[model samples]
Target: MLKGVAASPGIAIGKAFLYTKEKVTINVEKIEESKVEEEIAKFRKALEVTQEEIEKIKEKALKEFGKEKAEIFEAHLMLASDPELIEGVENMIKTELVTADNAVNKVIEQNASVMESLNDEYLKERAVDLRDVGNRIIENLLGVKSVNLSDLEEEVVVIARDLTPSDTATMKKEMVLGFATDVGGRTSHTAIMARSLEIPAVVGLGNVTSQVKAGDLVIVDGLEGIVIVNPDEKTVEDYKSKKESYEK
Candidate 1:
């Protein structure tokens, strides 16, 4: 069994659905002066597109999870339109002669790292929001579409490098048996969202994503933060009884 932290409670037994998104690589190149305006324009349009997507997510969060969850989306919306962020990207494109995507990556990563290093837990939580928002814009600029989990049709235990609120908010109860992540803590987005949804989860499983593949039979022992892969039938029955007792 893979050992990690129990971020949520209960046990999940299902096929593993690997939520392995290929990392998007940014192309950093010096651009000609003539392309500077085009790059800034692309940045502007990306921000607008990202805002629209965030609006839909915000509405979904509001309708499903209520006010508090939706508020984080609102903050994300604000961050997208932040004048300072806009100017930073625009200025970098013009002054540094870099691709729009590159400037966006630099600015957002700078801000995200700063927030991540802050001592306050509240700000760190918000850092996830910022990173998520920026990543959406970068995806837009690069013309890549990410698959949302809300579209899954099978019951499975999702394994990911990590998950943010935006990614988890779209989850369907019937499709997701539970989930685990490579990294996170009790207060991380995955942990909070999993607990709120009562979806059993273990986090900080340093290399679970690398070890498991799609269709691997897996068990998520959230109570003890143990993830068992292809367990024996006896162990399966044990968790079945363990789950029964957990509900009682």
Candidate 2:
């Protein structure tokens, strides 16, 4: 059986790859010690960009996920746009002698910690938005380069420790045959999206994510939430027949 969080719902198969978040870096050595004003300006620019991203996220979530679900993103936008958040980052730059990127990272982490300490599920979910937005801004501040989308050309079963929404977003759905992950459940976005995209997916696979490799032949049944790895010829034929029956 395959395991993973069912972020979206549906069935699909594809190659799996790790989703790397953009990282933020700070270099004290690169800048002249006297140009503190320029450094502060850089921080402001990053903040503005992050604020804009928050707005975009709000719009997208509202348009696609509904007003209620989109409210979560709105809250995140508010938090990220908080005056205190910017103040905290500025303080770090002024007093701690940290780079703008590092300061923003620290501020976001601090806010994340506060959110984590809350007992409400709604507040907890917002932490995801906080982290995602923060990471992007950090990358902007530090000038972290981006990598090209990792793609797998053939139809195969995706096995991974976990799949992020962005990871699946970059995939060509037709090339993926099925999926199995070691984590997640029905409420997870990955599982939900999988179903919505009409891709065969199974999450909460535990160790199975680590057990498979690229190019592994696999069968996925989203309806039954089942996955078969390295299937025998009979199983392949059976699935083929099942597909034909499904088409009919």
Candidate 3:
């Protein structure tokens, strides 16, 4: 069994579903002088759509997780609608003649770097959230669908290097069996959301993402901070019995 920090309590036995990070490719192509206005319009439309999406998520968070937890989405909405971020992207497009995707990408990278360089831990954490929000708008501008966890068809124990708040917020109860991550402590957003959702989770494994693959039979023993991948029949039976007893 691979050991990690237990972030939530309980156990999960399901097929491993690898949660890959969003891999968006932005080609830094220059737009024609006449097409600069068109590019700006595209960015504006994407920003609007991104804001609408965040609002929807905020509403859902309020209903399912209460106002305290839902406030996270409120922050996300604010970041998406930030005037400075918008102005920066617009400036890049107007002066640099870059595509909407490139401009947004550059702006996000710049902002994230600034956040990361700050001395405060809280501010450092917000860097991740900033990228998450910015990525949605960039994806919209690039005509790529943002990866979503709200509609997974089968029960699964998610394995990821890291899970952003967006992924956690959109997770469907019936689809997610539990989660194991390569990095994150108990106070990390992924762990906090797992507890709020009562989804069993083991985090800070540091290598689970590299070891496990999609469809692998895995056991997440959250109470003990153990993740067993491709266990033998005897191990499976033992855990099955333990699971039955835990659910009793």
Candidate 4:
């Protein structure tokens, strides 16, 4: 058994499914002055694509989840279309001659860092959401495939370092049995989604990701704030009973 931050009150007994996101690397290279128009156009196109993507996700969120959850993606849409952010990118591309991805990285990181350094709990959490919106644009600009969570094939406990609003909002119904992550607190996206969906979840288990691999039998006790990997048959039965009682 391993201790973690209890995110929701429930239990889970299922196979572990590791959800890994691709690492994004943005290059901060200088572009030629003659290439300014084309580069600015590229940034605008990416912004458009990102907005469209967020709109679709927002619609899905409203359809699949609730209005409040869908509002998160609506915020993302505003971020993508924000005149300030758009101008920031365009101005940087023209003045600094940096690639679109680099400009986006710098600007978004700066804004996110500002929010993260502030003292409010709610504002700090929204910093992660801003970064999430930024990443979607960067991924589009660089042609990287962003991970979407709508394709679960079996019931499993999802393990990740962290989860984004978009990842949770677009999920299929009742497929994810639980969530265990390396880092996060109660109001994080994973926790919020788990509770809203009423799925068992434990986060802030610093090494849970390293200890269990995909397909491992895992038990997540959200009420007890623990996760058990490859538990004995007896342990599994105990959790099954516990889960039954919790859902009653």
- Best TM-score among the predictions, by candidate number: 4
Candidate 3 per-residue lDDT over residues 129-164, each given as its tens digit: 788888888887776753455557887887888766
Q: Model 1, which residues run further than 4 Å from truth?
A: 109-128, 185-189
Residue range 15-132, candidate 1, lDDT tens digits: 8877756567777788898999999998999999999988888887787677777888899999999999899989988889999888988888888889878867888877777777
Model 2, 86-154: lDDT tens digits are: 788777777666677667777778888788888677766777667766776676677665332234566
Clashing pairs in 4: none
Tens digits of per-residue lDDT for model 4 on 1-248?
78888878798888887776667777678988877777789889999899888888788778879787789888888888989989998888888888888888888999889988887778777877888888889888877773444566777887777665567677754778888877764346677778888797888898787887878999988888899999998998998898888778
RMSD of 3: 3.2
Which candidate, 2 or 3, has the higher lDDT?
A: 3
CA lDDT, every prediction?
0.81, 0.62, 0.80, 0.81
- Model 2: number of clashes? 37
- Candidate 4's TM-score reads 0.82
Root-mean-square deviation of Cα positions for candidate 2 versus the true structure, in angstroms: 5.2
In order of appearance, the predictions have TM-scores of 0.81, 0.62, 0.79, 0.82
